């Protein structure tokens, strides 16, 4: 594990086919991983065949930069979020025709429920909304002004069984819509994430015990990092957001929180994602600056476990 | 194999593409002055214009487009850091089978 997840080897580069300046901002694998899905700075979404490298479809989703993509487990649905243009988030269908199903006009981030995906959780500033996928109707809003932490990058989220919600550093019980606990605030930005094991809560550098609210680990190398887990919850990838984007990503052992490797890519990292096989890692990689009137941003594909 | 719907980007008309470009540049500017320093906007606009319009001789449409992509990236960077600062939809699918 420390051997495999410390070795990465670039095998291809994807660029926007018709552009003079590539403008990718976001990536995700499709449900069956035949395609890489790439959002762009202008609000389009491009699908590239991983095997052949060909672009196969382009869609027009938003009017500003794509910030988040999440295909549903079955591949019939897709969530998107953008940057400044309303609607900021939306729900698309991916069957015979690409179509828009629902708008979440003011939600800057959006996520499927984790057990059965019949619900969407949305985030508007410090407020969480839960929606029903069929109707689009808002089922409940979670908010408490006396308990808020006002994290700058707040992103509400379900726990693996869908019985709990984390929002702005507050544990909510969904069934009763009552606040259960409020986690101590030690940073200004990162609001936190559930471990796939269902036992721990990870908030910036602090790992808390979900049952007893004990402080279990302090992991300094996670500070201000955007966190992603692999499919089995054994490995964490992180990329630092202080352009404030770091040029490295770090791998961690997800069971004991021990560091594995730091991989310098010599490009600013905008985003990254993993398949379900631990075969490939995809990274959005930027070079240049506003001063040079050049912000070429490309996607590099890596083999995991080979050097 | 996995299948995906055909793209709809090509289903936008020429006329509506030009209007999209004109309308969006104006809107991004009005939005960006509430997040980014005003003189940064002015500076990127004027430099983009000197380079692609005056120096390289590209159309005003191409020039506006290179400029928009740069501002969209600036806005992306601003919002990812976290922000506490004080209209026709998508084109139709192509007809199935064609």
């Amino acid at each position: 594990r420390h051997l495999i997840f410390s070795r990465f080897r670039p095998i291809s580069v994807f660029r926007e086919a018709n552009e003079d300046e590539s403008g990718f901002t976001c990536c995700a694998f499709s449900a069956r991983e035949r395609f890489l899905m790439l959002g762009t700075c202008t609000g389009q979404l491009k699908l590239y065949n991983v095997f052949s490298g060909q672009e196969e479809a382009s869609y027009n989703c938003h009017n500003s930069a794509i910030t988040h993509l999440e295909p549903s487990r079955d591949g019939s649905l897709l969530l998107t979020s953008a940057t400044w243009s309303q609607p900021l988030s939306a729900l698309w269908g991916m069957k015979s025709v690409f179509d828009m199903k629902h708008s979440f006009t003011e939600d800057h981030y959006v996520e499927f429920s984790k057990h059965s995906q019949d619900r969407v959780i949305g985030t508007k500033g410090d407020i969480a909304h839960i929606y029903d996928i069929q109707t689009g109707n808002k089922l409940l809003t979670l908010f408490n002004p006396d308990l808020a932490n006002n994290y700058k990058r707040n992103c509400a989220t379900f726990n693996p069984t869908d019985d709990l919600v984390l929002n702005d550093g507050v544990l909510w019980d969904v069934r009763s819509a009552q606040a259960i606990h409020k986690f101590d605030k030690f940073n200004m930005n990162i609001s936190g994430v559930f471990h796939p094991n269902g036992l721990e809560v990870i908030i910036n550098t602090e790992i808390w015990d979900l049952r007893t609210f004990h402080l279990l680990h302090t992991v300094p190398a996670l500070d201000q990092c955007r966190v992603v887990f692999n499919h089995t919850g054994t490995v964490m990838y992180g990329a630092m957001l202080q352009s404030p984007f770091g040029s490295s990503f770090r791998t961690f052992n997800a069971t004991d929180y021990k560091p594995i490797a730091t991989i310098d890519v010599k490009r600013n990292i905008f985003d990254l994602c993993t398949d379900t096989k631990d075969c490939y890692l995809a990274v959005i990689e930027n070079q240049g600056s506003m001063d040079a009137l050049n912000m070429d941003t490309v996607c590099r594909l890596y083999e995991v476990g080979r050097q | 194999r996995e299948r995906i719907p055909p793209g709809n980007s090509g289903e936008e008309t020429i006329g509506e593409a030009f209007d999209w470009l004109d309308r969006t540049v104006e809107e991004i500017n009005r939005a960006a002055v509430n997040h980014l320093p005003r003189e940064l906007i002015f500076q990127v606009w004027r430099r983009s214009w000197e380079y692609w319009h005056d120096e390289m001789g590209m159309s005003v449409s191409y020039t506006k487009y290179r400029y928009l992509c740069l501002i969209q990236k600036a806005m992306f960077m601003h919002c990812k850091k976290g922000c506490r600062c004080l209209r026709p939809g998508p084109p139709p699918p192509p007809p199935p089978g064609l």
Binding site: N18, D20 | S9, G10, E11, I14, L21, S59, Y62, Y65
Partner: peptide, 19 residues
């Protein structure tokens, strides 16, 4: 102009580049 981009074999960028 009601010509589709696909009818013209153009992307947005190419359309703006030509004029």
């Amino acid at each position: 102009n009601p010509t589709r981009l696909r009818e013209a074999s153009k992307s947005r960028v190419q359309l703006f580049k030509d004029d």
